[PDB]
Every structure is written in structure tokens, then in C-alpha cells.
Amino acid sequence: PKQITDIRKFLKISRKPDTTAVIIMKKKSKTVITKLKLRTKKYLYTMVFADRKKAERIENSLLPSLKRIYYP
Amino acid sequence: SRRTKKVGLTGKYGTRYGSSLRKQIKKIELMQHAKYLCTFCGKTATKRTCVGIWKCKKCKRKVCGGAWSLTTPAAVAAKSTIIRL
Amino acid sequence: AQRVHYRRHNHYNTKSNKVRPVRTPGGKLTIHVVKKKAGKPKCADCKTAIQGVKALRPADNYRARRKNRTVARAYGGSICARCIRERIMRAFLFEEQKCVRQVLKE
Amino acid sequence: GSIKRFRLKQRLGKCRRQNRPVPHWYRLKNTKRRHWRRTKLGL
Amino acid sequence: GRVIRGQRKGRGSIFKSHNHHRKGAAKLRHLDYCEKKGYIKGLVKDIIHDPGRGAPLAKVIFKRTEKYGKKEELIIASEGMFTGQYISCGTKAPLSVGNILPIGKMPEGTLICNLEHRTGNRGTLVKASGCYATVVGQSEDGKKTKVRLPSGAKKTIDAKARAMVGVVGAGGRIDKPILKAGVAHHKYRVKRNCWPKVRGVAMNPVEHPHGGGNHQHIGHPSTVSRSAPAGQKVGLIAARRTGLLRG
Amino acid sequence: VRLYKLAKRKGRHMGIGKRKGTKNARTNQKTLWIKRQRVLRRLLKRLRDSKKVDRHLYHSF
RNA sequence: UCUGAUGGAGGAUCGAGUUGAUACUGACGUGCAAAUCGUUCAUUUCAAUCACGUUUAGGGGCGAAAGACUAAUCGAAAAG
RNA sequence: GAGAACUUUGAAGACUGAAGUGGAGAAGGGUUUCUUGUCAACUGUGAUUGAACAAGAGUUAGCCGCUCCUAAGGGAUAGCUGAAAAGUGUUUAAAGGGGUCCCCGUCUCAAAAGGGAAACAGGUUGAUAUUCCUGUGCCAAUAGUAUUAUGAGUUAGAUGGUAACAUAUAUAUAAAUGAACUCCUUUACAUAGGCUUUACACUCGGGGUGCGUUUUCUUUGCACUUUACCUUUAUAACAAACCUUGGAAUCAAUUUACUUGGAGAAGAGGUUCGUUGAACUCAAUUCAAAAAUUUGUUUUGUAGCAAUAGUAAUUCGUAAUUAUCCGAAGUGGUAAGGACUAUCCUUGAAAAAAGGAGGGAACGGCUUUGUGCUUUGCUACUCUUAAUACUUGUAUGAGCGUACCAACAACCGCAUCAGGUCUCCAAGGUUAACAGCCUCUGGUUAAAUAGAAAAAAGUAGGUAAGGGAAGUCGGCAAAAUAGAUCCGUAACUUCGGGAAAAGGAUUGGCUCUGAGGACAUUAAUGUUAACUCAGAACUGAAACGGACAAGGGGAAUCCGACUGUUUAAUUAAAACAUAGCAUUGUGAAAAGCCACAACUGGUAUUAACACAAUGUGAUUUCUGCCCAGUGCUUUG
RNA sequence: UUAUCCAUUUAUAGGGAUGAAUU
Numbered sequence A: 001p002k003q004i005t006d007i008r009k010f011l012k013i014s015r016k017p018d019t020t021a022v023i024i025m026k027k028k029s030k031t032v033i034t035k036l037k038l039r040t041k042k043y044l045y046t047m048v049f050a051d052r053k054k055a056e057r058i059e060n061s062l063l064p065s066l067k068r069i070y071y072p
Numbered sequence B: 001s002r003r004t005k006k007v008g009l010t011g012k013y014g015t016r017y018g019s020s021l022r023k024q025i026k027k028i029e030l031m032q033h034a035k036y037l038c039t040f041c042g043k044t045a046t047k048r049t050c051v052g053i054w055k056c057k058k059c060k061r062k063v064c065g066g067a068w069s070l071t072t073p074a075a076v077a078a079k080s081t082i083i084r085l
Numbered sequence C: 001a002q003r004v005h006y007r008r009h010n011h012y013n014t015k016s017n018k019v020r021p022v023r024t025p026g027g028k029l030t031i032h033v034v035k036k037k038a039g040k041p042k043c044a045d046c047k048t049a050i051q052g053v054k055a056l057r058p059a060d061n062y063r064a065r066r067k068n069r070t071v072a073r074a075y076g077g078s079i080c081a082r083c084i085r086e087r088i089m090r091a092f093l094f095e096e097q098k099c100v101r102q103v104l105k106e
Numbered sequence D: 001g002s003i004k005r006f007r008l009k010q011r012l013g014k015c016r017r018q019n020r021p022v023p024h025w026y027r028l029k030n031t032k033r034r035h036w037r038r039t040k041l042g043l
Numbered sequence E: 001g002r003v004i005r006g007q008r009k010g011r012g013s014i015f016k017s018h019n020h021h022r023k024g025a026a027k028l029r030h031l032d033y034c035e036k037k038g039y040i041k042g043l044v045k046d047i048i049h050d051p052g053r054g055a056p057l058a059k060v061i062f063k064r065t066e067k068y069g070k071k072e073e074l075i076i077a078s079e080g081m082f083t084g085q086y087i088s089c090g091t092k093a094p095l096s097v098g099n100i101l102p103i104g105k106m107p108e109g110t111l112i113c114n115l116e117h118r119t120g121n122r123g124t125l126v127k128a129s130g131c132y133a134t135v136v137g138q139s140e141d142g143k144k145t146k147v148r149l150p151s152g153a154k155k156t157i158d159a160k161a162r163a164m165v166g167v168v169g170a171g172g173r174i175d176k177p178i179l180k181a182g183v184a185h186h187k188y189r190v191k192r193n194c195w196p197k198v199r200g201v202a203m204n205p206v207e208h209p210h211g212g213g214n215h216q217h218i219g220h221p222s223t224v225s226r227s228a229p230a231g232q233k234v235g236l237i238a239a240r241r242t243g244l245l246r247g
Numbered sequence F: 001v002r003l004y005k006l007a008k009r010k011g012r013h014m015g016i017g018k019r020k021g022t023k024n025a026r027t028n029q030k031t032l033w034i035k036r037q038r039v040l041r042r043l044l045k046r047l048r049d050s051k052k053v054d055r056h057l058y059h060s061f
Numbered sequence G: 001u002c003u004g005a006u007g008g009a010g011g012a013u014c015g016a017g018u019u020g021a022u023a024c025u026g027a028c029g030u031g032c033a034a035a036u037c038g039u040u041c042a043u044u045u046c047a048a049u050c051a052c053g054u055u056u057a058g059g060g061g062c063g064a065a066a067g068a069c070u071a072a073u074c075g076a077a078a079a080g
Numbered sequence H: 001g002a003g004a005a006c007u008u009u010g011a012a013g014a015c016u017g018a019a020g021u022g023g024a025g026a027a028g029g030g031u032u033u034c035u036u037g038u039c040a041a042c043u044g045u046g047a048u049u050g051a052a053c054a055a056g057a058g059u060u061a062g063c064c065g066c067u068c069c070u071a072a073g074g075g076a077u078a079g080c081u082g083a084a085a086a087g088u089g090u091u092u093a094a095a096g097g098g099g100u101c102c103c104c105g106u107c108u109c110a111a112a113a114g115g116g117a118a119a120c121a122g123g124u125u126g127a128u129a130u131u132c133c134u135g136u137g138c139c140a141a142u143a144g145u146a147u148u149a150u151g152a153g154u155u156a157g158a159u160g161g162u163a164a165c166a167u168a169u170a171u172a173u174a175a176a177u178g179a180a181c182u183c184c185u186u187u188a189c190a191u192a193g194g195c196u197u198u199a200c201a202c203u204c205g206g207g208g209u210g211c212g213u214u215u216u217c218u219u220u221g222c223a224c225u226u227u228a229c230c231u232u233u234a235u236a237a238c239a240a241a242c243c244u245u246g247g248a249a250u251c252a253a254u255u256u257a258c259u260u261g262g263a264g265a266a267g268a269g270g271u272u273c274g275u276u277g278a279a280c281u282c283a284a285u286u287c288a289a290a291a292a293u294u295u296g297u298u299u300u301g302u303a304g305c306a307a308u309a310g311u312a313a314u315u316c317g318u319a320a321u322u323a324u325c326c327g328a329a330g331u332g333g334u335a336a337g338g339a340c341u342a343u344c345c346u347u348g349a350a351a352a353a354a355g356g357a358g359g360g361a362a363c364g365g366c367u368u369u370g371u372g373c374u375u376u377g378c379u380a381c382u383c384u385u386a387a388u389a390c391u392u393g394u395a396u397g398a399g400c401g402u403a404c405c406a407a408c409a410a411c412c413g414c415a416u417c418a419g420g421u422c423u424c425c426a427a428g429g430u431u432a433a434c435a436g437c438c439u440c441u442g443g444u445u446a447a448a449u450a451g452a453a454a455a456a457a458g459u460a461g462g463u464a465a466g467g468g469a470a471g472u473c474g475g476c477a478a479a480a481u482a483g484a485u486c487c488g489u490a491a492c493u494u495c496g497g498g499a500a501a502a503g504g505a506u507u508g509g510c511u512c513u514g515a516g517g518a519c520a521u522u523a524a525u526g527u528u529a530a531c532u533c534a535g536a537a538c539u540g541a542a543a544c545g546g547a548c549a550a551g552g553g554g555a556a557u558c559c560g561a562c563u564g565u566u567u568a569a570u571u572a573a574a575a576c577a578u579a580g581c582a583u584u585g586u587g588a589a590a591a592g593c594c595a596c597a598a599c600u601g602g603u604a605u606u607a608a609c610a611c612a613a614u615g616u617g618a619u620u621u622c623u624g625c626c627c628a629g630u631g632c633u634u635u636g
Numbered sequence I: 001u002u003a004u005c006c007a008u009u010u011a012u013a014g015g016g017a018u019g020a021a022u023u
Helices: A007-014 A053-061 B008-013 B019-032 B073-084 C058-063 C081-105 D006-017 E005-009 E181-189 F002-010 F029-050 F055-060
Strands: A021-028 A032-039 A044-049 A067-070 B046-048 B053-056 B062-064 C019-023 C029-033 E039-048 E057-063 E070-076 E086-090 E100-102 E111-113 E133-138 E145-148 E154-157 E162-165
Touching (some): A007 A032, A007 A044, A032 A053, B073 E111
Antiparallel strands (some): A021 A032, B046 B053, E039 E057, E100 E162, E111 E133, E145 E154
16 A cells, blocks of 8 residues: 555556556545545555545546545 | 682682682683783783684784683794794 | 464474564454564675665565665675775785885896 | 375375265175274374 | 493494584695795684684685685684784795794794694694694705604604694693583583593493492403403503603 | 552552562662662763763763 | 672572472372372572484493383393 | 253352463374264263264465475495495596586485565354455566567766765666676574663553442442554664764763773764664645745644454444544563673584675677678667567466364373373462462363261371370471561681571551652742652551461581482482593504494594593592512513 | 505696785
8 A cells, every 4th residue: 555645646647557446535534534545456545635625626537437436 | 899808700619619629720710811912903902702712802803822811931932933033 | 461372383482483462453462473683794804784785684685676785886785985995005005015116126 | 183295184084984884775785994082093 | 241332432323523513624725836836825814713622723715826716724723823814835935923834944943733744634743722843853865854743752754744833722721620510511512422431340240341349449450451352452551551650 | 459559659568577579679779770870870961961060070970 | 908889600599380209118009090199309501401303223222320221121122 | 851960041159360171383193173963882870962873064375384495314326345135425437507618516305493585454154264255465477579658878888975875766766787707795593691672461540432339438340442464664763883073181981781982082963774663743735934946833644554444332124324442651571672791621503595796708770892890871779667469389376284182081001091292372469479379351160970977997187285206216297487677697618608507676557757760941940750668656355478478407427529410110329420630542544442244434524732541539638568479561 | 666555636837046816
């Protein structure tokens, strides 16, 4: 498992052919924070989003033919 | 304070073995555990490593010597005769 | 308290079978075998540990990156820096004395 | 023991197989029987 | 009777040398043209302890002449030699402690070790710690020279035989009293199975000629002839004399 | 056990008729020396660092 | 020379465990047991203890020595 | 159930008491394992039980092991002996590999505790789990050509730092030319002692949740409150070592201890390794101050794994919802690491495998002349990772073990035998303590029998007035204190001891008093921890190491100096050994001692401070006379 | 010295005047 913080690196990894699935995790903190995890052949890359607006925008902009799995 | 009147380092032997044997072993353990002058670095830090090997803690250099002392009179005499020429 | 047991077919506490207890997320205390600690690489002359180079066991050293196995100067990763400098001056000065003896022969 | 050789394991299986009783239908027309605790097969 | 303990030693079953941790045989360089007509200098890279013996050994590095490379030699160290020292070997090597010279080249009265009783056997005499031989004379024609061995015997050896100038280190090892049986146990643990001894007079007559009786005595003269068979040579073998010495 | 520990904190069950190990076994004298030396050395280092004492007096003490 | 600390040596001491086996000449002695049980006792940094592997084979081995041990067999094993 | 003291369930009373009939393994066993039946015999009483009998079933691995390496060593080859059988194993070996003529080179086996490519958590079955499922990783391998793509380098091999050294973060730190030939390092190593760090363990307090006590008291007692491998995990911190600057006696730095310095200390600033593995604002983000990207201030996240899993709860058809999973500390038990010090007439394996270096052999591409080279005309090319396509024989992951017992009835003792049998984990109280005794988790309440009665006698214990060894071969057996603190301690002595000599006093509970540390502010004030000593009152049937645990001393004599060893199953000793002492042989491959039928071999990887053969048996003080006898030995 | 025997080695130069060093 690898955590990545750069949004451009995240999208660049997502667009790659190896990537198959994106995992969406949402949970209440104290506000709901989320974690987006691309599943590649080598590693599983997660980025943590504190806000909801940016997380939704990234999820929508995410390439759609790769399958989505929501854990909650 | 002074811990032993005369037994010295042989106090580790307690009362075992003869007094003469303990005194004789004391006489040479005294010089077996002593520090000797390292003629290469000039610091008195040469200690016995094994039965005939003496290592300088500073030089890290080791030298063949006597069983219980860095030098033996028989060896120093021979070296003196050789260097005379 | 929770008691543990060996898991790696070796049930004697030899130096290759040292273990570390660890508490799992399942709330149970288990045992993991610790890797044997490797000695540090040493200089060829002074037999002193050379810095800038990792101290991995051969299996790990095979997988380590090249940057982590060497230094970058002369006998790097084989001779310590002070020994190398002493060898430098020894070579140069001894060639110099040889040359001056050759020129003083006549 | 738990760790065994292949030949030893096959021998154990054969010795277990030979411990079954005579079939009933055959009895319409055994003595070489052993118990694991009484007679050790030594092999 | 049965085979006695001395007889069982030659079978070499449990009486072989405990040699697991020995560092190698102590030998000088094999004779070479360099050693015959010049000096070759080797650097004593290290001096180590050989668990069998009392004298320390010297790991000496020579540079091969027939091919590129370095050769390693294990030479019984002389008293006073140190790591990082260059020792010269051969006919033309200067006479100094640690050098290897032919016996014919050293003057009379010098002390030597690592002697070759026959030229080229790379070292056979004077090797136990603290021992030395004295060169007590050379022949007029060269070719022969007389030495006095640590046993006090004069021996005549050809002049080309080599030896090391100096005395072998770790001298005086005898003067320390082994205080306790444990030190003797550890001493012989790395040499042989010659210890403890057990007196033959305490055995039974079946396994020793000294054994038996109601009083633990020899019963017959303890000096045995040189021609006595293997199970019979048990006492003082071919003794020229007995009792305390007076000179 | 909590109540007994509280009583011990008040010093209730430490009498000489309640001790079974020797004095050193109960309170290691080497450890007592260790603590005392460490506090004295810490104090001396603090004084030298704060310059309330000089280097020579620090070494002497 | 004397005093107080520090230090941690020793085939040092007590002592569980381990390894043994002093005494009761206890029990048992058609035993739980072809050598056990109970109490007592010796031993614990070393000539220490244990395991596996390996070597030595019978007029031979091995023995800190008791004619000990060498598969319940030893002043010459066991099998034919 | 026909039948129940010994089958099952519930309740109770108890035990085992983390040195366990608790969990894992090895040797050995071999199906005893599981389920369903079942009782002829066995399960020394019963028996419906069972390790019995019967029928079925059950053991899943690239990561756990073997397999590989080498050790003590075994077998074999060449020889050489021998009738052979066999004995030895390089003693006249032309004995596999490498590059490309030369270099190196007997083979093979021997470790399920040594060395060693790589795995974790949760869940799952009647029986298997680091093996299955889910998820997340890691290791090794991956041929040739051609395409792409990723990075470098170049108009033939990169760059920073004074230095210690550092730098490739591409999905992925993959590439930083390098032959022959070399030289190193890792693998790779003893013991003792303390100091220190971390993890785990234990414990204290707070918050939440559930349960329990509740005649009375109790802001209460108990349980849960978790977080793996992997990410060079990033960083932080620390012991060390090194670099730069610095230039030391009024010597200084510094440890528990000693260690260190003009061969360069302190101070100041750095580098690296190693410990650990989210520490530290660590990361990202908000807000202010530096410029054609730096420093201070917030939020978020158990750093990713990760909560989706576990755990403890509250509800809902019967599979789902919900809430918690966070604020601080102390003790030092175990394990590992670190830096050290000390000991040795003891110096405490090897190889497979891997790495570093020294050295500098070879050199673009397209086309062309002439016999790989000189040549003319042009330049955007070489390495490295990944993917795809085709060719290549089918272009990932072999085989074997995996159930169960491990003794209490699965092993060995003829047996379901009070015996024996190797390793790891190791809670609380009291305490020096892994002792003893009691307890929590786990396990058990079973032992070739039960009930009743309870005399003799036996056996294992208790207690006994007065006397106190009169008993007896003999104080055999038992009794006597025995912990800790304070005091006191003789003869003798090898000066080390004797010594816990001998011999006294005290000890509970309660209420107090005193001493012993750490952390910040402008010389003075606050916050906070450990149990450890000392002293005083009071108190009680004068008792308090209350149980448990736990020396009897002294005066002498004999023997052996001591520690140690011994007749397995009648003798543990004064016997053996021992250090010390003395004697003897031997200068070597034509030697000493010993083995062998021969060949050959052990000591010997040895060399007189050695090897071999003897006697005596620490120390102290001694060791007298006899060479006629018998031995041994020397000359001719 | 040729039989025979022994020793050493990688059978590695014919006799007289503490850097490496190989193509």
C-alpha cells in the first residue's frame, strides 16, 4: 500500500492501463472525510481527502471505464 | 582503603593452592596484566591479547612478545647483539 | 497473560530463531521471527567499519540499490577515507624519494 | 512423526489398508490383523 | 591381559589431535630462485594465535614473482616482530630479527629459530615458544655449519639451510604454575586426549604391568629395556640412570 | 491490593519484621549510587553550562 | 602507610531448577517399578548440564581406574 | 438407556496454580484424528463410555520445512597391498569448468536446532491451515527479434559537497561504460559483568460502554476500549564512528565502571551506520513574512495498510442498523540491540551465496573504394525499465512432508506400568525469588472399584507431665533457630580466611515525623513521581520472619590438600583425578612412543618451553646410608 | 650416479660482480 498526496500524480496513475478499480471510502471524522484508492497491479495507492467538494470533483473527473467499488 | 595486606591480585584465589604457588603466580600475573610502552606511538597502552601477542590500544598495532611480558631478556639480548654489528 | 508458540518449524532459540511478540489487530499476541543482524562492512586495511554503506545480510545486499553499497572515491566501499589518504601520500612521497635517490646516485 | 518420507508414508498407508476385515460376501464361502497399540509394525 | 592405554594411542581413534580450530601448518616459503640468489620481502599482515601451540603465528603476505598476485604464508613468529613489518627472505637478506637467511651467512653466536635440519624442508627445528638455537661455528669451506639446539645438543647442518634470526615468541610460558586441574583440562582440550594420566600402579594387572597387588607398588624394576615389546615398555624406557641429577 | 499499596505508600508495612530479603536485595546499593552520581553530574553540568561555575571548579567538584 | 567509596574477580558461598544418590540400613520387597516411592542429602560459571550428529567393535573398544561400561548380558558381549 | 458412583447437561464444593494433566514442536508411534453407529471380547468394579469394534471421511504451500552449502565425518575413484575377501585414500592421475591458447580443478554423501531469496492480518471446517477464502504484499525467474513507451548519457561512459559523503522517487530510485587478471568485505561466530534503549508483559489514574454488589457502605468491583506484514516506510530521537572549524596545564571532556586527547581535546557546525518504525507538525491544507520559490499560524489523518477488519454494546423481519474503540503515567519481568570493561598456557567452524574495489581489453550510425582494415557523401544515436506482437517444443512458481499423541492411557519399559524421555511461551498476591502457599486465563474434578464400620496390627504423621541420651554398637530417628536489621565474634592461619564463628537484641497493626528526585519564570514562586531507609507516639491476653519458607553449635583426633570423579541395580570413600615435584626416552621421515597381514598409518596442521613413558600427589619443612642381589644402561 | 631411499613444490629463472608492481 502506498499513499500519494499529489493530485496530478493521482490522476496520472489513474489514467494508466494497469489500473483496474477505484475504491471509495467515506467516513465521519468528528464532516465526512474520504479516501480514494486506485488498485494497480503493483500497489494500491490511496489519497485522503478532508473536504467533500474536491473529493466529488476528482471522483467525477475520474476515468469511467475503470470500475468503482464503494466500501460503505 | 587498602583491601589486602599482601595477597594482592591473588585474592581471587582465596585460600586454595599453596602460599608459595600463589605468590609465584602473583609475581608474573602482575606483569602479564600490566600496560607496556608502545614504541610506535609512545603511549603506554600495550596490553596482552593472547599468550604471546601484544596489542596497542592506540596504534591498533600488535607485536609478538613474551608469554607474560612484552619483552624477554633473552630476546632483547639477542637483538642487542644483532644490532651491534 | 497470552502465551505464544513458535510458527517457523524451528522450535529452539538459536541465534537465527530470535522472536518478537506483537499484538495483532485481532487482539491476539503472536510471534514474528526477527532477521539476524548483519555485521558492518570493514576496511581492508584497518578492519574498521566503512561509513556510507549499508550493513545488510548478503540476501538483502543483493537487492539493495547500488548507491547504498558504495561510496564515490578511489577504493570506495573497500578502504576507509583516512586509509585512502594515507595511501595517497605514501605512493606519491615514496615515488618522490625514489626519484631523488636516483638523481643522487650520480 | 509429522515429518515423513514418501516411501515410509506409502508403507503406512499400505499397512492401514491391510488391516481391514474380510468382506462379508466373501465370508459366505482374518488372522493377519494388528492393532496400533499392541503390535508395532517396526517398519 | 588386555591392550594397555599406551598401545591404544597408535590406533588414532580418540587420540587424534584436536585440530578443528588450527589456522594451518607453520612453514617457511618453498625454495625459489629469489630466495637462492637474492632477497624477497614479505609484509607481516597479521600475527595470530594458533590454538594448538603456544608460539604465535605470523600471517605474512609475499608478492608472487611468476604471476601477478599475492601468496600467503604462516610462519612461526619471532619475539619482537610486529604487524606492518617487512621481513626479507633469501641469501642476500640483511641479518636482522625476523629475516630468513641461510645458516652459512649468519656469523657465529647468533640466535635462530625455525631451523631447517635439511635444506628446503621449510622449517623443522626450534619451533616451540621461547626456544632458540645458537650458531656455534661454520666450516672453513663453507658448505657446513654447527648449531646448538635448545636441548643442548650440537648438530651439523649444511650451510644452505635456512632459519629465522631471533627467538620464537611467547617465551616463559612454563614459569606460570597451572594452578588448577581446569586449566590443564582446557590446555589439553585443544591438543590431545593425553589427560588426565591415571597411574598404572592404580590399575589392575590385566591392563598394565604395574597394576595389581595389595599395596600399590611396582613390584619389579621400573627400568625397561629398549627392546621390550609394545605392551611391555611401560616404565622408564632404556634409562641410563635414575634418581636426582647432580650436574 | 490497591488498599495495601496505599498503606505502603503511607509507610505501613515496611517494618523490619516485614522484610525477608537483605538490604541490597530490597534496594540495590549500586543503583542508589548510580542515581546519586547521575543527579550530581547533571547538577554540575547545568552549573557549568549556565556559567554559574567555572571549568576548573567544575572539574574539581 | 591509614580511612571511605567505587569496582565486580574467583574451578568463591547459600540455594530452587537440573544432574545425582548420603541416611532412614524408612516404605515396597507375590512391588507402581527385574531398582520404584517418601523424607533427608550432594550439585548449580564450570574439569558444568542436555540434545542431535559422528568416531572407536569383542582377546577388541572405552575407562578422572570400580575388573567399570560396551542394548536388564562382561575377570572376555550377543548371534549362528 | 434394559440397566448409570465412574456417559451427557445444569447447580455446588474443590483441584491443577503459568516450573500447569495449559498451549506449540522434535524423537518415537502410525490413523490412535473427525463424524455416524456400536458393545462379542477389551476398557483388572460398573459402563450406555473409549485410544475398543464397524462404515465412511479427513492432511491443500513459490513465502513453513526438506531439497542447496559446508562440519565432525562416511563412501568411492587413482594407485598400492592382499589368494581373494577386503585395508588405505593422491602415496610416479595425462583426472570437469572458464574465458579464448592458456588458467583453475578427485567425486559424492553427511545438519528438519549451524549457514540460508521471499508473508502478514482477518475469516473459514466435523476433522487442514503463515497451506483454504478475502485483502494486502514479498522473492526468484522471465529467450531471441521487432515495435512502442520510461528515463538517463552523448556531437566513448552524469553530477553536487572543503570534507565526512550525497544524488536517478520513472506506476517502478531501472540505467552513473567497463574485459582479462588480482585484493578485500559480508556470510562469520567464546565467556563474564554491569550500564543503557526499544518492543512485549504487568500495573495506576481519567473518559465511554456493559455487567455485578447494594440489610448497611461504596462517585463502587469487574470486562472491553485492538491495529499485523509491507511502503529503500519517510522522518524524529539516541549510543557510536568520521569530517570541517577550533588549538588544549590552572589540564580538560567524561562513565555506573574507565575511557580519551598536539598521532589534535573541549566548544561550534556537520556526515554516516546501526537501533527502532508515524516518533517529530510527519504529510497535505488555511492564514502572514521572503522573489523572476523560503519562514512562522490552523485544519485534516489512528501516515498508507485501517476499519471495510476485530472487540464490547443497543436495536430491527430473522440478515440489516446504530454508537465506542482516546487523555495521560508507573514497575522492571522477559527478549533483542547498543556502547563498553574484563578472562584465557582456553582466543572460541567452514562453504554455498552476495557485494565492493584495483586495472583499463572493446567501441557511433547510413552508403561506398580497395585486401576486419584506409577511403569518400550525411547525421540526430547508445544504454535501462515496462508493455505488446511474432518466432522459439507448451515462455511462471517442481517434488515430498502437513491428520493426531507427544505421555495425563497414543513413545520405550511384555500393559491403559506412580519409571524414563529433548525444546519454546510463562499472569496476580506475599516475597529477594520463575521458591513455598493461595488465586485469574486455560485445564480438571480422573486415576485396576465403591459403600459401611472403624477394633488389633501395619504404614505416613501429630502431641505428651517430670527427667533429658540413663536408650543404643553408634543420638539411628526426631527435636532444637533457621528470614531480615543492629551489635559482637576466639584459637589458629598459607594473612586470603576461620565467620552465618561463638553469642546477644529487635520484628505486628495504626497515627505520624524526617531524608533521598524531575520539570519555568523573572536571587525568589509553582507542578509532579518511585518505594526505600530512619525515628516517635499509641495499641494488643508480651505477640508479630505469627502460616509458608528457613544453618544446630563448640572442643579435638585420624585421612585426603582443595573444586572434581567413581563400582548403572548392596561399597561415594581414606579410592581415582588434580596442580605441584621428580625421573626416563627422543634432534626426525634410517628419530622416540604406538597401530597394521601387507601396503601404510597415529602423535603430526607436531619439533625439546615438544611429544612420549612413569612414579609421587597443594603449601611448609625435609627427602638420610647401601650398586652387594635383580633390573636398566655405557666402552671395547 | 644410474639402482634404491628421503624431503619440497604450482616440480616456476645456469653460475660468478603496513601503497602496487599483471595485458
